[PDB]
Ligand binder design. Structure first.
Ligand SMILES: CCCCCCCCCCCCCC(=O)SCCNC(=O)CCNC(=O)[C@H](O)C(C)(C)COP(=O)(O)OP(=O)(O)OC[C@H]1O[C@@H](n2cnc3c(N)ncnc32)[C@H](O)[C@@H]1OP(=O)(O)O
Ligand SMILES: CN1CCC(N(C)c2nc(N3C=CC[C@H]3CC#N)c3sccc3n2)CC1
Ligand SMILES: [Mg+2]
Length: 411
């Protein structure tokens, strides 16, 4: 059934994942010395390429590959169109490893044919709370706590093979070469998400959306007027009214984050994330990188009253190409990123996120039911989508957990 994933150090079945009690590695300990120094073999017509992410032109080539060949919805109505500014942000965080960005080009014309990216992350990935309890009950605490320390691992994203090169087993070769490059830096685990079901997720959550521009969403068939709107004389008018938001934020004290906020944001975020079983640990430089506002990419607001930052939220933009329609050629989506509330209810904080996103011309707000995202779904009129995001580790045995115990946002 899985000619590639059966050869890899991942859980092979759902059962296996449901049996796992303690976090830890799957494969045998290896050193950097054990790992081949030479790139994985590839067909003579292709070549490995390491793009320079601080080269506008290299970013551009990656951008076009993804624009034309990255994830679509199941109806081929929308294809993500991550911007070049977004890709530089995502691909080049503090202390990134240039060699973890792996491309394949056709040797002749040097056409970019495939890509995968890895970036560093520091992740808490030790045994979940409810397994450390079963463990104490069992007299098995030391084993349960062995890998409690945050680990410096790899987060994989943006795997993409050109449409003309599909179903030729190129994706496995990319994954093998990325693994080699990561392993050669003495990193042995990776975390990745996908919409598809592979062997084998440790958590899975539904997608949710909140309409901001229902008129447009209906036009492009992102949305359809649901059946109960038919018993109305003007269904569209009732839909627009349903999703209407204030023109201006409601929280006094709300403003954009600035560099001086970085310590307080790091502290309140770390306190909040601490509480989930799987979650990132950020340095000040990483808080700066992932949360300070960047035009068209990431938008972050703090609640400061009394010279004190008590709350914040962030969202990032990913537009999609609208493949079919031609009144509109882009869907402009805002995604809930990190947040922390200490002074106001989370629904009141995130309402301001929707107000701001709508004000700035976003069409829809998306999120997965990670973090405490479920706590504001109904009041803020989110609906579940058809999709799920599945979370996976490479080379890491981990108990199945609920998505509300996951605190890692993946771009
Ligand atoms: C320690 C360091 C480790 C670092 C590595 C950690 C692992 C990282 C793992 C990657 C995490 C990526 C996270 C994201 O970026 S998820 C986003 C993935 N990208 C897209 O969906 C973009 C559009 N689709 C494509 O570009 C291609 O269809 C891809 C590249 C997805 C497959 O290309 P193609 O369609 O031409 O197929 P093939 O003949 O070459 O290959 C067939 C094999 O590929 C397995 N497959 C299919 N889809 C995925 C998928 N999304 N993750 C992992 N494996 C996948 C499939 O089960 C089969 O294996 P097996 O069933 O036969 O066994
Ligand atoms: C690897 N990733 C591709 C883009 C995905 N992203 C950004 C997304 N995905 C959505 N998917 C709905 C079905 C599965 C999944 C696609 C995949 N893969 C949805 S649904 C609404 C927003 C949204 N965003 C986030 C990480
Ligand atoms: Mg292929």
């Amino acid at each position: 059934a899985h000619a590639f994933w059966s050869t890899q150090p991942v859980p092979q079945t759902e059962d296996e994942t449901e049996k796992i009690v303690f976090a830890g590695p799957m494969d045998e300990p290896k050193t950097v010395a054990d790992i081949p120094e030479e790139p994985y073999p590839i067909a003579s017509t292709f070549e490995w390429w390491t793009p320079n992410m601080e080269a506008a032109d290299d970013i551009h080539a990656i951008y076009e590959l993804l624009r034309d060949n990255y994830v679509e919805d199941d109806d081929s109505m929308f294809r993500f169109n991550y911007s070049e500014e977004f890709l530089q942000w995502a691909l080049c965080p503090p202390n990134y490893i240039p060699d973890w960005h792996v491309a394949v080009r056709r040797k002749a014309d040097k056409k970019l044919l495939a890509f995968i990216a890895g970036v560093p992350v520091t992740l808490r990935m030790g045994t979940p709370k409810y397994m450390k309890v079963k463990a104490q009950e069992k007299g098995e605490g030391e084993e349960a706590a062995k890998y409690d320390e945050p680990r410096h691992i790899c987060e994989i994203n943006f795997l993409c093979v050109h449409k003309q090169l599909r179903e030729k087993r190129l994706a496995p070769i990319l994954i093998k070469e990325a693994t080699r490059r990561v392993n050669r830096t003495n990193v042995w685990q990776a975390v990745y998400t996908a919409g598809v079901l592979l062997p084998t997720p440790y958590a899975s959550g539904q997608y949710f959306h909140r309409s901001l521009n229902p008129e447009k969403l209906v036009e492009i068939r992102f949305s359809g007027i649901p059946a109960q709107y038919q018993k109305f004389q003007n269904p569209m008018a009732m839909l627009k009214r349903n999703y209407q938001l204030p023109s201006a934020p409601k929280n006094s004290g709300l403003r954009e984050m600035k560099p001086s906020d970085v310590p307080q944001v790091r502290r309140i975020l770390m306190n909040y994330l601490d509480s989930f079983d799987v979650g990132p640990v950020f340095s000040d430089a990483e808080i700066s990188h992932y949360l300070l506002p960047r035009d068209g990419v990431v938008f972050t607001y703090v609640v400061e009253n009394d010279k004190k930052v008590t709350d914040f939220f962030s969202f990032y933009r990913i537009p999609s190409t609208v493949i079919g329609n031609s009144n509109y050629n882009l869907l402009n989506a805002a995604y809930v990123h990190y947040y922390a509330a200490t002074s106001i209810p989370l629904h009141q904080l995130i309402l301001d996120l929707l107000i701001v996103a709508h004000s700035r011309g976003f069409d829809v707000c998306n999120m997965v039911e990670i973090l405490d995202n479920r706590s504001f779904v109904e009041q803020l009129k989110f609906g579940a989508g058809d999709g799920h995001l599945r979370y996976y580790f490479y080379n890491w045995a981990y108990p199945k957990i609920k998505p509300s115990q996951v605190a890692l946002v993946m771009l």
